mmCIF file of C-alpha atoms and ligand atoms in Angstrom:
data_model
loop_
_atom_site.group_PDB
_atom_site.id
_atom_site.type_symbol
_atom_site.label_atom_id
_atom_site.label_comp_id
_atom_site.label_asym_id
_atom_site.label_seq_id
_atom_site.Cartn_x
_atom_site.Cartn_y
_atom_site.Cartn_z
ATOM 1 C CA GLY A 1 33.902 -16.882 -4.390
ATOM 2 C CA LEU A 2 31.722 -17.887 -1.442
ATOM 3 C CA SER A 3 29.682 -20.997 -0.685
ATOM 4 C CA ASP A 4 26.015 -20.699 0.116
ATOM 5 C CA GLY A 5 27.002 -21.604 3.741
ATOM 6 C CA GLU A 6 29.375 -18.689 3.823
ATOM 7 C CA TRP A 7 26.788 -16.284 2.245
ATOM 8 C CA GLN A 8 24.310 -17.473 4.881
ATOM 9 C CA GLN A 9 26.845 -16.364 7.560
ATOM 10 C CA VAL A 10 27.387 -13.057 5.833
ATOM 11 C CA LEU A 11 23.706 -12.250 5.727
ATOM 12 C CA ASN A 12 23.304 -13.537 9.339
ATOM 13 C CA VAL A 13 26.035 -11.131 10.421
ATOM 14 C CA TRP A 14 24.472 -8.416 8.343
ATOM 15 C CA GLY A 15 21.278 -8.780 10.413
ATOM 16 C CA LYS A 16 23.332 -7.366 13.208
ATOM 17 C CA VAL A 17 24.289 -4.310 11.147
ATOM 18 C CA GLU A 18 20.729 -3.695 10.015
ATOM 19 C CA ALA A 19 19.314 -3.613 13.500
ATOM 20 C CA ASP A 20 21.360 -0.391 13.888
ATOM 21 C CA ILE A 21 22.672 0.713 10.473
ATOM 22 C CA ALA A 22 23.483 4.311 11.416
ATOM 23 C CA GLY A 23 25.369 3.278 14.568
ATOM 24 C CA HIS A 24 27.397 0.658 12.697
ATOM 25 C CA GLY A 25 28.021 3.050 9.784
ATOM 26 C CA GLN A 26 29.190 5.796 12.138
ATOM 27 C CA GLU A 27 31.657 3.533 13.962
ATOM 28 C CA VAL A 28 32.994 2.204 10.746
ATOM 29 C CA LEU A 29 33.746 5.635 9.346
ATOM 30 C CA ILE A 30 35.231 6.754 12.730
ATOM 31 C CA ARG A 31 37.516 3.613 12.772
ATOM 32 C CA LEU A 32 38.562 4.438 9.206
ATOM 33 C CA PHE A 33 39.178 8.188 9.860
ATOM 34 C CA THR A 34 41.015 7.737 13.106
ATOM 35 C CA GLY A 35 42.961 4.677 11.948
ATOM 36 C CA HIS A 36 43.901 6.057 8.666
ATOM 37 C CA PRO A 37 43.692 10.002 8.820
ATOM 38 C CA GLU A 38 44.724 10.454 5.132
ATOM 39 C CA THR A 39 41.377 8.970 4.207
ATOM 40 C CA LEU A 40 39.622 11.962 5.907
ATOM 41 C CA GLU A 41 41.208 14.178 3.238
ATOM 42 C CA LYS A 42 39.110 12.506 0.542
ATOM 43 C CA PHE A 43 35.985 14.025 2.103
ATOM 44 C CA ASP A 44 35.560 17.800 1.613
ATOM 45 C CA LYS A 45 32.574 17.693 3.918
ATOM 46 C CA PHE A 46 34.337 15.850 6.815
ATOM 47 C CA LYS A 47 37.843 17.209 6.476
ATOM 48 C CA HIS A 48 36.774 19.865 9.099
ATOM 49 C CA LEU A 49 36.560 17.168 11.802
ATOM 50 C CA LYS A 50 39.798 17.265 13.700
ATOM 51 C CA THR A 51 38.753 15.311 16.760
ATOM 52 C CA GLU A 52 36.962 11.988 17.290
ATOM 53 C CA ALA A 53 34.396 13.749 19.500
ATOM 54 C CA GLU A 54 33.472 15.976 16.674
ATOM 55 C CA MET A 55 33.180 12.887 14.547
ATOM 56 C CA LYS A 56 31.014 11.148 16.983
ATOM 57 C CA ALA A 57 28.799 14.237 17.299
ATOM 58 C CA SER A 58 28.370 14.672 13.558
ATOM 59 C CA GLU A 59 24.882 13.723 12.287
ATOM 60 C CA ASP A 60 26.079 14.132 8.728
ATOM 61 C CA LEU A 61 28.714 11.631 9.345
ATOM 62 C CA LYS A 62 26.213 9.173 10.691
ATOM 63 C CA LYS A 63 24.130 9.988 7.623
ATOM 64 C CA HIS A 64 26.922 9.173 5.308
ATOM 65 C CA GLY A 65 27.556 5.998 7.385
ATOM 66 C CA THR A 66 24.001 5.003 6.582
ATOM 67 C CA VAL A 67 24.492 5.742 2.896
ATOM 68 C CA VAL A 68 27.665 3.633 2.750
ATOM 69 C CA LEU A 69 26.390 0.633 4.602
ATOM 70 C CA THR A 70 23.056 0.696 2.766
ATOM 71 C CA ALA A 71 24.963 0.463 -0.474
ATOM 72 C CA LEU A 72 27.244 -2.320 0.899
ATOM 73 C CA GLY A 73 24.234 -4.179 2.267
ATOM 74 C CA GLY A 74 22.384 -4.031 -1.093
ATOM 75 C CA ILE A 75 25.644 -5.423 -2.684
ATOM 76 C CA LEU A 76 26.102 -8.196 -0.131
ATOM 77 C CA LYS A 77 22.377 -9.217 -0.528
ATOM 78 C CA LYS A 78 23.183 -9.989 -4.131
ATOM 79 C CA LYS A 79 25.540 -12.780 -3.076
ATOM 80 C CA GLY A 80 28.216 -12.026 -5.664
ATOM 81 C CA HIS A 81 25.760 -11.051 -8.468
ATOM 82 C CA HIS A 82 26.412 -7.382 -8.055
ATOM 83 C CA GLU A 83 27.791 -6.191 -11.432
ATOM 84 C CA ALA A 84 24.953 -3.652 -11.841
ATOM 85 C CA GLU A 85 25.211 -2.353 -8.302
ATOM 86 C CA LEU A 86 29.039 -2.216 -8.117
ATOM 87 C CA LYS A 87 30.075 -0.734 -11.532
ATOM 88 C CA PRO A 88 28.675 2.897 -10.706
ATOM 89 C CA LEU A 89 30.457 2.755 -7.291
ATOM 90 C CA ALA A 90 33.667 1.614 -8.947
ATOM 91 C CA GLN A 91 33.242 4.361 -11.492
ATOM 92 C CA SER A 92 32.369 7.197 -9.072
ATOM 93 C CA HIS A 93 35.175 6.246 -6.661
ATOM 94 C CA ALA A 94 37.793 5.897 -9.381
ATOM 95 C CA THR A 95 36.869 8.934 -11.474
ATOM 96 C CA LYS A 96 35.127 11.408 -9.125
ATOM 97 C CA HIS A 97 36.299 10.666 -5.646
ATOM 98 C CA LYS A 98 39.707 9.271 -6.597
ATOM 99 C CA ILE A 99 39.800 6.604 -3.832
ATOM 100 C CA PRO A 100 42.794 4.354 -4.129
ATOM 101 C CA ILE A 101 42.005 0.607 -3.617
ATOM 102 C CA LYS A 102 44.178 0.589 -0.490
ATOM 103 C CA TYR A 103 41.436 2.651 1.210
ATOM 104 C CA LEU A 104 38.909 -0.033 0.451
ATOM 105 C CA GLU A 105 41.255 -2.454 2.180
ATOM 106 C CA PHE A 106 41.327 -0.123 5.141
ATOM 107 C CA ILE A 107 37.413 0.181 5.415
ATOM 108 C CA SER A 108 37.186 -3.647 4.952
ATOM 109 C CA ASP A 109 39.259 -4.267 8.057
ATOM 110 C CA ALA A 110 37.454 -1.488 9.842
ATOM 111 C CA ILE A 111 34.121 -3.289 9.361
ATOM 112 C CA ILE A 112 35.753 -6.419 10.815
ATOM 113 C CA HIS A 113 37.017 -4.396 13.782
ATOM 114 C CA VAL A 114 33.679 -2.742 14.447
ATOM 115 C CA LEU A 115 31.721 -6.040 14.407
ATOM 116 C CA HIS A 116 34.043 -7.536 17.074
ATOM 117 C CA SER A 117 33.803 -4.290 18.986
ATOM 118 C CA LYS A 118 29.906 -4.083 18.992
ATOM 119 C CA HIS A 119 29.422 -7.750 19.261
ATOM 120 C CA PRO A 120 32.219 -9.291 21.398
ATOM 121 C CA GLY A 121 32.019 -13.079 21.613
ATOM 122 C CA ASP A 122 29.127 -12.918 19.138
ATOM 123 C CA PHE A 123 31.133 -12.618 15.917
ATOM 124 C CA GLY A 124 32.487 -16.187 15.621
ATOM 125 C CA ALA A 125 35.531 -17.404 13.656
ATOM 126 C CA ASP A 126 33.285 -18.807 10.979
ATOM 127 C CA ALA A 127 31.377 -15.509 10.705
ATOM 128 C CA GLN A 128 34.617 -13.497 10.386
ATOM 129 C CA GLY A 129 35.879 -15.792 7.667
ATOM 130 C CA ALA A 130 32.754 -15.439 5.618
ATOM 131 C CA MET A 131 32.503 -11.601 6.051
ATOM 132 C CA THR A 132 36.196 -11.245 5.260
ATOM 133 C CA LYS A 133 35.760 -13.321 2.044
ATOM 134 C CA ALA A 134 32.777 -11.190 1.021
ATOM 135 C CA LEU A 135 34.618 -7.986 1.476
ATOM 136 C CA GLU A 136 37.626 -9.354 -0.484
ATOM 137 C CA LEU A 137 35.169 -10.144 -3.313
ATOM 138 C CA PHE A 138 33.798 -6.676 -3.280
ATOM 139 C CA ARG A 139 37.284 -5.146 -3.232
ATOM 140 C CA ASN A 140 38.557 -7.487 -5.933
ATOM 141 C CA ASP A 141 35.723 -6.717 -8.257
ATOM 142 C CA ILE A 142 36.242 -2.993 -7.741
ATOM 143 C CA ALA A 143 39.934 -3.501 -8.356
ATOM 144 C CA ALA A 144 39.162 -4.992 -11.821
ATOM 145 C CA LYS A 145 37.189 -1.855 -12.701
ATOM 146 C CA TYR A 146 40.062 0.335 -11.418
ATOM 147 C CA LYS A 147 42.443 -1.554 -13.712
ATOM 148 C CA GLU A 148 40.191 -0.985 -16.723
ATOM 149 C CA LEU A 149 40.161 2.742 -15.935
ATOM 150 C CA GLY A 150 43.913 2.850 -15.416
ATOM 151 C CA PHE A 151 43.286 4.208 -11.996
ATOM 152 C CA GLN A 152 45.998 4.071 -9.268
HETATM 153 C C1 HEM B 1 32.328 -0.406 1.560
HETATM 154 C C2 HEM B 1 32.955 0.572 0.850
HETATM 155 C C3 HEM B 1 32.176 1.858 0.335
HETATM 156 C C4 HEM B 1 30.889 1.931 -0.100
HETATM 157 C C5 HEM B 1 29.772 0.883 -0.116
HETATM 158 C C6 HEM B 1 30.749 3.303 -0.592
HETATM 159 C C7 HEM B 1 29.590 3.840 -1.035
HETATM 160 C C8 HEM B 1 29.393 5.217 -1.331
HETATM 161 C C9 HEM B 1 28.164 5.752 -1.863
HETATM 162 C C10 HEM B 1 26.854 5.010 -2.121
HETATM 163 C C11 HEM B 1 28.433 7.126 -2.059
HETATM 164 C C12 HEM B 1 27.505 8.121 -2.652
HETATM 165 C C13 HEM B 1 27.257 7.938 -4.092
HETATM 166 C C14 HEM B 1 28.438 8.092 -4.861
HETATM 167 O O1 HEM B 1 29.151 9.144 -4.808
HETATM 168 O O2 HEM B 1 28.907 7.062 -5.604
HETATM 169 C C15 HEM B 1 29.701 7.364 -1.586
HETATM 170 C C16 HEM B 1 30.387 8.602 -1.702
HETATM 171 C C17 HEM B 1 31.609 8.894 -1.332
HETATM 172 N N1 HEM B 1 32.522 8.051 -0.897
HETATM 173 FE FE1 HEM B 1 32.332 5.931 -0.830
HETATM 174 N N2 HEM B 1 31.931 4.002 -0.330
HETATM 175 C C18 HEM B 1 32.779 3.077 0.232
HETATM 176 C C19 HEM B 1 34.118 3.325 0.504
HETATM 177 C C20 HEM B 1 34.775 4.646 0.498
HETATM 178 C C21 HEM B 1 36.013 4.893 1.072
HETATM 179 C C22 HEM B 1 36.950 3.928 1.768
HETATM 180 C C23 HEM B 1 36.302 6.226 0.860
HETATM 181 C C24 HEM B 1 37.427 7.106 1.189
HETATM 182 C C25 HEM B 1 38.516 6.721 1.972
HETATM 183 C C26 HEM B 1 35.082 6.711 0.213
HETATM 184 C C27 HEM B 1 35.001 8.073 -0.276
HETATM 185 C C28 HEM B 1 33.709 8.649 -0.648
HETATM 186 C C29 HEM B 1 33.564 10.134 -0.881
HETATM 187 C C30 HEM B 1 34.684 11.176 -0.748
HETATM 188 C C31 HEM B 1 32.223 10.210 -1.373
HETATM 189 C C32 HEM B 1 31.439 11.552 -1.784
HETATM 190 C C33 HEM B 1 31.027 12.097 -0.392
HETATM 191 C C34 HEM B 1 30.246 13.309 -0.495
HETATM 192 O O3 HEM B 1 30.833 14.357 -0.789
HETATM 193 O O4 HEM B 1 28.913 13.249 -0.264
HETATM 194 N N3 HEM B 1 34.222 5.760 0.014
HETATM 195 N N4 HEM B 1 30.335 6.198 -1.202
#
């Protein structure tokens, strides 16, 4: 549950991501995959990547990074009013992709990490607080749908 001041910060930060959505998306996925290699096994089309150089060189990985952050951005722009947008993602990730909620925690922290990395000294404490709350909201609403589906 975010205040409008916090949403303002979220969307301000997101402006950074949108100036280079593919670059941000790429680095987020790389941080996830290298930080938590088990997550790589959920992707039949990336499981072949064994090194980070191969990851960095992968145009399809960058492409999926764009798809992921485009979807997240559409969701963030709803400022919490994202039931329509979130439900199919929850459903596809629970039932088709079988992504445990832990992995959504992983990618949440990865976004935080990447923002600091690409914007050192430009991602203030207030901005981190707001972004973290937004990602928690996202995760928590997915988690509710996971529970409905009995998905672990
Ligand atoms: C911010 C969090 C995430 C967002 C916004 C997101 C969004 C999406 C979207 C829009 C798609 C394509 C449409 C669909 O299949 O529903 C997708 C596919 C997929 N996602 Fe997610 N995702 C997120 C997190 C994750 C995580 C953490 C994992 C695994 C650790 C994951 C695994 C997958 C897989 C395996 C596919 C299918 C890829 C393919 O074969 O093309 N997702 N995701």
